[PDB]
Amino acid sequence: SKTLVRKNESLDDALRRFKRSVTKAGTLQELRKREHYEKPSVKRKRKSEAARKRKK
Amino acid sequence: RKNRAPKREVLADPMYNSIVVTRLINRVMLDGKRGVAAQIVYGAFKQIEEATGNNPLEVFETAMENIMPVLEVRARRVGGSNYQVPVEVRPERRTTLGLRWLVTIARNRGEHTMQDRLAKEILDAANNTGAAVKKREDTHKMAEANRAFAHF
Amino acid sequence: MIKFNIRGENVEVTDAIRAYVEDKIGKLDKYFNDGHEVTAYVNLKVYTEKRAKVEVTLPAKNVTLRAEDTSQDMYSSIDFVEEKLERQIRKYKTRMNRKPRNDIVRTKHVALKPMDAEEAVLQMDMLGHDFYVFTDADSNGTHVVYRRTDGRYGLIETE
Amino acid sequence: RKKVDFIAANKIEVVDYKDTELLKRFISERGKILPRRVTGTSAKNQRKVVNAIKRARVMALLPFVAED
Amino acid sequence: RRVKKNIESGIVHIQSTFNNTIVMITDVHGNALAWSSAGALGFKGSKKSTPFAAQMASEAAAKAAQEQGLKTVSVTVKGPGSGRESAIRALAAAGLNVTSISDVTPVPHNGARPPKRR
RNA sequence: GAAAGCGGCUCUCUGGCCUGUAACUGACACUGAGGCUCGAAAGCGUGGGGAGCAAACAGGAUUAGAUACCCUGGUAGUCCACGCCGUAAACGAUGAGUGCUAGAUGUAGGGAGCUAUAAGUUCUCUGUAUCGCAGCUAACGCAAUAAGCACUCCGCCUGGG
């Protein structure tokens, strides 16, 4: 499971581990978009051409 | 405006050997009275010549240390959120602002002559304390509030 | 507020509807902070009111804005034009208050259609390269003709 | 470089829940699923697997919540 | 004449909120004697999550950890913010022994409704 | 799924299609006023459950002012069984049935081949896009899931308030 530690990591090396890998965690987008609650017809404004703009 | 449009240059001194002799003329000299201005500047290294009799650059350069701060300020807003994000400009402009400082306190003192209240601030510049070091620490203490750079 | 300059510039001045001016700019003194200076400057002419010109200028302490506008009646110009000053301050709410408003390019072959390996002699001569970037139509796959340094038709070919 | 859906690799149909990580490399490093875009999945065949992964995530044979 | 300890592997509970940050240094399960926040210091205003102010917030209790007498750190960060990063490099460089910066920001799954529109 | 809508997981009984198929009925077809059913969202009835959220209202900024946006809260209400309203941008402001047909195109899941020492392609059906032939309109645009060309069931519409 959680190793929390890159292989003999340094300070800036673990900083780049958490920046890189914890930036690819997805741990921030759902939170900042979960600042406030929204209407479920706005939840499918979320489930719309943002993701279709991402892939296509 | 758009460009780095050119500045101008006055010549350095051959008498006491400083360009801030004639730049001290560039702040004390009003109505273009350059000969009276050199009478005050040469009279001020004469004020050194009674007090210490040393080189002009001891009092003049220790004074420069007193009146050249590290940091200056700038207005930078988000949409009104005026983070006073600072800068540290180069010694021609820092020396220029110190020349505003010595023309300020060495001008606006109610004493007898220009060389007498400028004897108060060139001689108290030889006392190298008080108004000048506070006149830069008034911006130096602000820098901890100027800690923000472009953050939010 | 601080100061006026009431000026009827064609007809004499009468302080009933000028007092009505003074009261709607009294409502400027409901929307004031320092009513620094104003000036009435009005103009009515002959031929049974084929115009009604009025004016008041507004040098406040930060903004300046005048008003030389019309109606048929001068009373209606005082009405609709000082109401226009009310709606101007209604335009001047956010314009006053809301000072916040809130090496090698990693890419494929740039050519589209495939050209055969004999055409690579012309395809090297097409764009001006010593090689010839062309998906081979004759040879199954990709082929290219280089320039050997002896001077003959070269071939940059895995082949 | 193919590496799509693993379906032609474990061809066919088995199980898709009685592996440990043979099917469950579909996990992310943070206990969630690999993307249908990075994996780039055949949609309802991915549903033919994920419709029992959603079981097998949380059947107490697998850490359903994790990080790193 | 008070009870004191000499622990070495403290557990550094630092919560970066989206307005402030506590900087805490903890026992083995634990509990914190050497601990602080940004808002412990009077940086109340726009200065509430300046990251170098967060550096000194991640420095003050950090140097207060030697009252107990610990040098190696068992770091645990929770929550992001607008001052998190220079705090992270701060306690990565605060007279400490950075080996394990934990990341314990808890995650719901379409949980409670947040407060509404803005 | 007719829509309304429907997403932790597992069971229970549960419609509805499509692919093939002539095994079979032998036109049983399409509709659809009337009548009937279902049905957003709230709210209303009774009885619970009462985390978080939030009408009502309060406090603090806000400014001339704030009964508003922000913050602190915070009642109704949101959830569960149990009855009702029948009105929503009902939307795609595009009725229902079926026929016709340039193509570039998505993706499902079948049917078939298919590509074989494991690969990867072609046709077929309902799906849902995007461009665009023809046609097309006041223009905008539609165009195979036609705003094109037909017919049967219905419905609306008559200048504005």
Element housing B130 (H / E) = none
Which residues of D spanning 9-68 put their CB closer than 7 angstroms to strand F?
A: 42-45, 48, 51-52, 54-55, 58
Which approach determined this entry? cryo-EM
| Pair B60, B52: CB distance under 8 Å | no
Q: What is the nearest nucleotide to E114, using C1' and CA?
A: F53
| Pair C67, C54: CB distance under 8 Å | yes
What is the DSSP pairing of strand E73-78 with strand E101-103?
parallel
- The phi, psi pair for C111, rounded to 5°, reads -80, 160
Distance (Å) from CA A42 to C1' F88? 17
Q: Which of C8, C58, C7 is nearest to C29 (CA)?
A: C58
Resolution to 1 decimal place, in Å:
5.6
Q: Which of E61, E57, E71, E62 is nearest to E94 (CA)?
A: E62
Distance (Å) from CA A43 to C1' F154? 38
DSSP state of E48: G
- The phi, psi pair for E37, rounded to 5°, reads -145, 175
**Which residues of chain E does A17 touch, with a Cβ-Cβ cutoff of 8 Å?**
none
How many whole angstroms separate alpha carbon A34 and alpha carbon A51? Answer: 17
Q: How many residues would you count in chain A?
A: 56
Rounded to 5°, angle at Cα E86 from E18 and E63: 105
What residues form DSSP beta bridges with E75? E12, E101
Task: Collect all residues with Cβ–Cβ distance below 8 Å to A18 and sequence separation of at least 6.
Answer: E88, E101, E103
Dihedral sign for Cα C80, C86, C90, C93, please.
Answer: positive
**In C2-152, where do the E strands start and end?**
39-40, 53-59, 64-65, 68-70, 134-136, 141-143
Burial (CB count <10 Å: 0-12, 13-18, 19+), residue B51: middle
State the angle between helix axes of B56-67 and B131-140 in degrees (0 to 180), rounded to the nearest 10.
30
Burial (CB count <10 Å: 0-12, 13-18, 19+), residue A21: middle
Tokens of B118: 């400028």
Tokens of C118: 């004999």
How many whole angstroms separate alpha carbon C58 and alpha carbon B11? Answer: 51
- The phi, psi pair for E13, rounded to 5°, reads -80, 105
| Pair B46, B112: CB distance under 8 Å | no
E117 touches chain A (CB under 8 A): yes
Q: What is the nearest nucleotide to C90, using C1' and CA?
A: F64
How many whole angstroms separate alpha carbon E112 and alpha carbon A37? Answer: 9
Q: Which of E50, E40, E18 is nearest to B85 (CA)?
A: E50
Smallest Cα distance from A32 to chain E, Å: 10
What is the DSSP pairing of strand E10-16 with strand E73-78?
parallel
C93 CB below 7 A from strand F atoms: yes
Amino acid (one-letter) located at C92: Y
Half-sphere exposure of B32 (CA within 13 A, CB side): 0
- In chain C, the N- to C-terminal Cα span, in Å, equals 95
How many whole angstroms separate alpha carbon E26 and alpha carbon E13? Answer: 7
Half-sphere exposure of B125 (CA within 13 A, CB side): 31
**Which residues of chain E does B152 touch, with a Cβ-Cβ cutoff of 8 Å?**
46, 49, 82
